[PDB]
């Protein structure tokens, strides 16, 4: 028998002479209250010879957990928990943890605006308590808890969108100049619209121009944010062009939320962090006091005007609903054949080129709704429109997933069909915990047949992957052409 927890082999050939086990005693001729000499688990946590359990190299660590003192050798539980928890349950606990992390991020951003939800904080406590050492061992309960986390994330994104709309108005379409103007510059990266508003308020009259980057692009749609003239436009693209963007523009850089990367020496003395963002050797902004960043921007050599391009962002729900009747006409005529939700968080992985290919081969009688940084794979494509309806529609940040939700609910009422009968396909890009919370949000809405890229989450063992694919029909991204062919044929 080899120990499930620490892979200690009890071999009936040796026995244990020091304890009374003369050499030759079978495993089942051991005392009843005998425990493991390494991990202190009973006779049950001994399995008849499995085979080279750990010995992991290219992958296959069965599980990981070192949160309690019982952990094997004081380093990590990696096959089975000393507490008795198996690998699948540990991975489900980590899944719930990531979802609640995404919820907590959106919660922090809402509270930045004075918007609070008590039941969500209670659920945070409840979930983190559920992932303690010896509290919960039920996997199905963790499925239930993941779905409840999806529901709470719906609620949290709803609260954050209400915070944004009350503080800045409902976003409406805006053509954003991507390209520099003449003058000192501050580039802002992240999600915090409150930090951007404070900076814009502090820079009115200073004459330094403020540009958005990555997930701060949707700010150009908010009436309370676009009203500032020194909000010049976009500059750079998604988060991972950061190191080149911040290098090439001679500007002060401020990172407001996550997706900030370790800086390169070219712009290290001209970068700042604020909110929760924090980098070693980078100056951090005390609350919202952006005096150092403005100082830097005015000390730096100004930017140079450049032939600019444009991006179109900020489709609030109301702008889309003012087009519902034409969309109805167009689908019933047949001049629009399907809606595709293609977006979410991105990564510099090669498999994410899939997205640029996917939209590039999409038929021209289709429309795309995009989201988060994964929009920067195809938002510059000149796709045009269908009888006045744009083929690309930018709802905003990842937290604007919620309006996407609202949209389908309208569409189900528009065409008088159940949600899982619409001419709608869903293609997710995920990268972080916020995306995990969004994914479980979509799963709590029973959205079947969704596609996911660039990879399946690293915390999902075979058990979890199969539960998703057989109970929720979550389809991994494969080949763009074949995927489109599968999604569009009711024939």
* From ligand SF4, a copy of itself, Fe ion, none, interface partner of 8 (C-beta below 5 to 8 A by class): Fe ion
Is 36 labelled a binding residue?
yes
* From Fe ion, a copy of itself, ligand SF4, none, interface partner of 34 (C-beta below 5 to 8 A by class): none
Task: From 68-76, 100-108, 247-255, 473-481, give the range in contact with ligand SF4 by CB under 6 A.
Answer: 68-76
Q: Which of 6, 30, 36, 82 binds ligand SF4 (CB under 6 A)?
A: 82
Q: Please give, one letter per residue, the 3-state secondary structure of 471-486.
A: HCCCEECCCHHHHHHH
What would you report as the CA-atom Rg of the chain, rounded to the nearest whole angstrom? 26
Structure tokens at 124: 């945070």
- For the bound state, the minimum distance from the C-beta of residue 370 to a copy of itself, rounded and expressed in Å, comes to 18
- For the bound state, the minimum distance from the C-beta of residue 85 to ligand SF4, rounded and expressed in Å, comes to 5
CB atoms within 10 A of CB 440: 27
- Binders of ligand SF4: how many residues, by CB under 6 A? 12
Element (H, E) at 273: strand 271-273
Span 34-73, contacts to Fe ion by CB under 5 A: 36, 38-39
Q: Does 352 bind Fe ion (CB under 5 A)?
A: no
- By DSSP bridging, strand 2-3 and strand 46-47 are antiparallel
Task: From 5-13, 101-109, 115-123, 418-426, give the range in contact with Fe ion by CB under 5 A.
Answer: 5-13
Alpha helices (H) in 341-400, listed in sequence order: 353-360
* From Fe ion, ligand SF4, a copy of itself, none, interface partner of 3 (C-beta below 5 to 8 A by class): Fe ion
Is 141 labelled a binding residue?
no
Q: Does 436 bind ligand SF4 (CB under 6 A)?
A: no
Task: From 64-72, 123-131, 230-238, 444-452, give the range in contact with ligand SF4 by CB under 6 A.
Answer: 64-72
C-beta of 81 vs 221, nearer to ligand SF4: 81
Closest CA to 233 of 167, 309, 288: 309
- By DSSP bridging, strand 252-255 and strand 231-234 are unpaired
Closest CA to 254 of 231, 219, 223, 279: 279
Element (H, E) at 329: helix 324-333
- For the bound state, the minimum distance from the C-beta of residue 298 to ligand SF4, rounded and expressed in Å, comes to 35
The answer to whether residues 435 and 346 touch, using CB atoms and an 8 Å cutoff, is: no
Q: Which of 2, 85, 194, 213 binds ligand SF4 (CB under 6 A)?
A: 85
Q: Does 133 bind ligand SF4 (CB under 6 A)?
A: yes
Burial code of 46-58, b = ≥16 C-beta within 10 A, e = fewer? beeeeeebeeeee
The long-range contacts involving 330-335, CB below 8 angstroms and separated by at least 24 positions, are 330/386, 330/387, 330/389, 331/415, 331/423, 334/365, 335/365, 335/386, 335/387
Closest CA to 153 of 442, 430, 419, 457: 442
C-beta of 14 vs 35, nearer to a copy of itself: 35
- By DSSP bridging, strand 338-344 and strand 389-390 are unpaired
- For the bound state, the minimum distance from the C-beta of residue 6 to Fe ion, rounded and expressed in Å, comes to 3
Task: From 29-37, 110-118, 260-268, 348-356, give the range in contact with Fe ion by CB under 5 A.
Answer: 29-37
Phi/psi at 448 (5° precision):
-95, 145
- For the bound state, the minimum distance from the C-beta of residue 432 to ligand SF4, rounded and expressed in Å, comes to 8
- Residue 65 DSSP code: B
* From ligand SF4, Fe ion, a copy of itself, none, interface partner of 57 (C-beta below 5 to 8 A by class): a copy of itself
C-beta of 89 vs 195, nearer to ligand SF4: 89
Is 191 labelled a binding residue?
yes
C-beta of 39 vs 330, nearer to Fe ion: 39
Q: Which of 15, 81, 102, 218 binds ligand SF4 (CB under 6 A)?
A: 81
Structure tokens at 154: 């719906």
Pairwise CA distance, residues 276 & 437, whole Å: 19
Angstrom distances, CA of residue 123 to CA of 129, 139, 141, 151, 395: 10, 18, 14, 11, 28
Q: Does 77 bind ligand SF4 (CB under 6 A)?
A: yes
Is 274 labelled a binding residue?
no
* From Fe ion, a copy of itself, ligand SF4, none, interface partner of 365 (C-beta below 5 to 8 A by class): none
Contacts of 204 (CB under 8 A, 6+ apart): 228, 230
C-beta of 22 vs 55, nearer to a copy of itself: 55
Q: Does 89 bind ligand SF4 (CB under 6 A)?
A: no
Residue given tokens 């800045």 in the structure block: 168
* From a copy of itself, ligand SF4, Fe ion, none, interface partner of 81 (C-beta below 5 to 8 A by class): ligand SF4
Pairwise CA distance, residues 216 & 236, whole Å: 11
C-beta of 70 vs 242, nearer to ligand SF4: 70
- For the bound state, the minimum distance from the C-beta of residue 61 to ligand SF4, rounded and expressed in Å, comes to 12
Q: Does 349 bind Fe ion (CB under 5 A)?
A: no
List of residues contacting Fe ion (CB under 5 A): 3, 5-6, 8, 36, 38-39
Residues annotated as binding site for [4Fe-4S] cluster? 65, 68, 77, 83
Binding site for ligand SF4 (CB under 6 A): 65-68, 70-71, 77, 81-83, 85, 133
């Amino acid at each position: 028998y080899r120990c499930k927890v620490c892979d200690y082999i009890y071999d009936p050939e040796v026995g244990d002479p020091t304890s009374g086990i003369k050499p030759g005693t079978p495993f089942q001729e051991l005392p009843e209250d005998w425990l493991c000499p390494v991990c202190n688990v009973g006779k049950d946590q001994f399995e008849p010879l499995r085979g080279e359990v750990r010995r992991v190299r290219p992958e296959d660590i069965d599980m990981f957990c070192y949160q309690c003192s019982q952990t094997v050798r004081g380093r990590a539980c990696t096959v089975k928990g000393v507490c008795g928890k198996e690998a699948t349950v540990a991975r489900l606990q980590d899944n719930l943890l990531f979802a609640i992390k995404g919820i907590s991020a959106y919660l922090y951003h809402a509270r930045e605006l004075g918007y609070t939800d008590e039941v969500v904080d209670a659920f945070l406590e409840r979930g983190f308590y559920s992932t303690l050492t010896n509290v919960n061992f039920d996997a199905e309960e963790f499925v239930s808890l993941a779905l409840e986390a999806g529901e709470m994330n719906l609620r949290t994104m709803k609260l954050l969108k209400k915070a944004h709309m009350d503080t800045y108005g409902e976003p409406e379409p805006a053509e954003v100049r991507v390209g520099a103007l003449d003058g000192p510059a501050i580039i802002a990266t992240g999600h915090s619209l409150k930090a951007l508003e404070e900076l814009l308020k502090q820079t009115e009259g200073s004459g330094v121009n403020v540009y958005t980057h990555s997930e701060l692009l949707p700010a150009h749609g908010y009436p309370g944010l676009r009203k500032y003239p020194h909000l010049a436009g976009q500059l750079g693209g998604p988060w991972f062009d950061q190191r080149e963007t911040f290098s090439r523009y001679s500007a002060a850089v401020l990172g407001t939320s996550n997706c900030v990367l370790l800086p390169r020496d070219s712009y290290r003395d001209r970068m700042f962090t604020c909110g929760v963002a924090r980098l070693p050797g980078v100056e951090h902004v005390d609350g919202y006091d952006f005096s150092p960043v403005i100082e830097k921007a005015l000390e730096l050599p100004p930017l140079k005007e450049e032939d600019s391009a444009t991006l179109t962002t900020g489709f609030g729900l109301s702008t889309i609903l003012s087009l519902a009747d034409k969309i109805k006409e167009l689908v019933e005529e047949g001049k629009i054949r399907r809606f595709f939700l293609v977006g979410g968080c991105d990564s510099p992985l090669p498999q994410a080129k899939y997205y640029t290919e996917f939209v590039r081969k999409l038929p021209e009688d289709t429309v795309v709704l995009t989201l988060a940084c994964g929009k920067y794979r195809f938002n510059s494509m000149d796709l045009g429109d269908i009888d006045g309806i744009p083929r690309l529609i930018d709802l905003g940040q990842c937290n604007d997933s919620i309006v996407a939700v609202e949209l389908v609910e309208a569409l189900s009422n528009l065409f008088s069909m159940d949600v899982n009968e619409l001419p709608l396909s869903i293609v997710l890009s995920w990268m972080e915990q916020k995306a995990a919370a969004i994914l479980w949000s979509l799963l709590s809405l029973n959205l079947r047949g969704m596609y996911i890229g660039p990879i399946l989450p690293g915390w999902a063992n075979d058990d979890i992957i199969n539960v998703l694919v057989d109970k929720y029909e979550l389809t991994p991204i494969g080949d763009p052409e074949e995927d489109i062919k599968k999604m569009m044929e009711v024939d």
